[PDB]
């Protein structure tokens, strides 16, 4: 699933990247625009954000203008938007033809539904949902 | 000749009870030394066969003194003090007077005790796929029945019909059966049981 | 201790050979006659044969449905006993065991699993069961070897699961059938290991 996943997605490189940073989600998602979301809220004051490009480089530097942790991430790709949902085979369905969902066991955790779940989720839909919704981290940590 | 060794081949036991298989020897057992040359064997389900009881009546070291055993000179008798959910399995009567031993005997058949249930009849017609795909298997199920003594007809006759009968769980304490009648392509165009759980037969067909 | 673990399983076809060694460990080798012992799948014991002990010195004694098919030897020094299989042929397709001794079989190694079918590795032809108005199941004809394991709802159902044992045709090939009976569009997933063949499959009257 990872090595197709970064081999399909390696092409999108050059419209758009991802960043992260530890801003509390109320100011970061007041100033966010021009096809620009919060990927993924690891806390109220650590957010992920998926934006595109000229506009997410200055979202780090909207947050180095603050003086908070800077990382241009180099692993920059893309996800969590339309621009990766496109394709609805090679990156929705293509990287996992194949899965075993497991029951109870001990529990694990999810984040894209915000709460903990039973092992049937995990599938190519998950990452389905991981390129097309958000992550919302901070209230699965909340409900952990 | 050959010593016929035959035990009541079926011992419904349930935990917490006394229960008493014994043997058939044709001819006598009981050599000049004074010992009995029989052996009692277990073959525990999914595991190895062990020693229970040899020369008759002498335990083995190991196994619970819950198999005591004794026996006269043609007629044998292990008196499985008590049995557990552990103690469910086949045991074997083997004669070990005269060598070879090719023959274990067919085996006990020992089971969860338990008062008799009604077999679940379902006639399952084969998918219309399969019929595309090459080949048509109709399945007579039988489910949550006990004791298993009943094989299933193929009529409107038998005779592609193989059994995948079950082993018994643990909470329920029933048998399943699985009657697969493979088929061909154009004969596509009925099944009953004669369990004691019911006395009229029942014909369901697909 | 005593052990008598064995090794020496596989996947062949009728007239070739296989290896089958009984290791032994805790005793003394020589002084009991190592016994070869084979158990049809789900059904009677049969037992193949025994080498005397070299102290006794004797014979090979065998069954008679392997004259000239199968030997035994024995040593000390590396203590291991010996089953030959020679022109193998379908019936040899069981559980062989290794018993210690030719009248008392008082030990009992573990079984390898000697397979002697003329099928090749390929995925199962999964065959779902519409039910008739109730239980519903999905066969899992034409599949080979036998590592299996069908779950329903893909694990999530455990409550009237029967997994059927393996189904034995003339073609060397197996045939599974697990069914749950509960009333109700369920799910039943086999997996293959060793050919990678996942099928997940719906079900409806």
């Known amino acids: 699933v990872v090595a197709l996943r970064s081999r399909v997605i390696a092409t999108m490189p050059g419209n758009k990247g991802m960043a992260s940073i530890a801003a509390p989600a109320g100011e970061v998602r007041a100033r966010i625009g021009d096809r620009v979301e919060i990927a993924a809220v690891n806390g109220p004051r650590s957010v992920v954000v998926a934006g595109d490009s000229d506009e997410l480089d200055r979202l780090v530097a909207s947050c180095t203008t603050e003086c908070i942790r800077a990382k241009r991430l180099a692993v920059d790709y893309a996800s969590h938007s339309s621009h990766v949902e496109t394709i609805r085979d090679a990156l929705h369905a293509e990287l996992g033809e194949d899965f075993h969902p497991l029951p109870g066991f001990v529990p694990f955790f999810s984040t894209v539904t915000g709460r903990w779940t039973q092992p049937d989720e995990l599938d190519a839909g998950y990452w389905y949902r991981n390129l097309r919704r958000t992550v919302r981290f901070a209230d699965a940590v909340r409900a952990l | 000749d050959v010593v016929m060794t035959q035990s009541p081949l079926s011992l419904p036991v349930t935990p917490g009870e006394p229960a008493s298989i014994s043997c058939r020897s044709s001819?006598?057992?009981?050599?000049?030394?004074?010992?009995?040359?029989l052996d009692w064997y277990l073959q525990k389900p999914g595991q190895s066969p062990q020693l229970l009881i040899y020369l008759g009546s002498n335990r083995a070291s190991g196994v619970p003194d819950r198999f005591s055993g004794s026996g006269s000179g043609t007629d044998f008798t292990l008196k499985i003090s008590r049995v557990e959910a552990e103690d469910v399995g086949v045991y074997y009567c083997?004669?070990?007077?005269?060598?070879?031993?090719?023959?274990f005997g067919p085996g006990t058949k020992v089971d969860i005790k338990r008062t008799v249930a009604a077999p679940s009849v379902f006639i399952f017609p084969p998918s219309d796929e399969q019929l595309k795909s090459g080949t048509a298997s109709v399945v007579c199920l039988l489910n949550n029945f006990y004791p298993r003594g009943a094989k299933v007809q193929w009529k409107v006759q038998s005779g592609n019909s193989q059994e995948s009968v079950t082993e018994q769980d643990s909470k329920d304490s029933t048998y399943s059966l699985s009657s697969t009648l493979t088929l061909s392509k154009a004969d596509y165009e009925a099944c009953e049981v004669t369990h004691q759980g019911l006395s009229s037969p029942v014909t369901k067909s697909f | 201790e005593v052990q008598l673990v064995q090794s020496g399983g596989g996947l062949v076809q009728p007239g070739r050979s296989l290896r089958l060694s009984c290791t032994a460990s805790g005793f003394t080798f020589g002084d009991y006659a190592m016994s070869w012992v084979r158990q049809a799948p789900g059904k009677g014991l049969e037992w193949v044969g025994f080498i005397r002990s070299k102290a006794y010195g004797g014979t090979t004694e065998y069954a008679a449905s392997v004259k000239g098919r199968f030997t035994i030897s024995r040593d000390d020094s590396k203590s291991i006993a010996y089953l030959q299989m020679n022109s193998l042929k379908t019936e040899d397709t069981a559980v062989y065991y290794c018993t210690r001794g030719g009248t008392l079989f008082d030990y009992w190694g573990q079984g390898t699993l000697v397979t002697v079918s003329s099928a090749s590795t390929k995925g199962p032809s999964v065959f779902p069961l519409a039910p008739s108005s109730a239980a519903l199941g999905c066969l899992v004809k034409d599949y080979f070897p036998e590592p299996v394991t069908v779950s329903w709802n893909s694990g999530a159902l455990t409550s009237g699961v029967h997994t059927f044992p393996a189904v034995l045709q003339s073609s060397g090939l197996y045939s599974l059938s697990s069914v749950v009976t509960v009333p109700s569009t369920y799910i039943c997933n086999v997996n293959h290991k060793p050919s990678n063949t996942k099928v997940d499959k719906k079900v409806e009257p």
């Open positions: 083997m004669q070990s007077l005269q060598t070879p031993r090719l023959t």
């Open positions: 001819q006598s057992l009981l050599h000049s030394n004074g010992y009995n040359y």
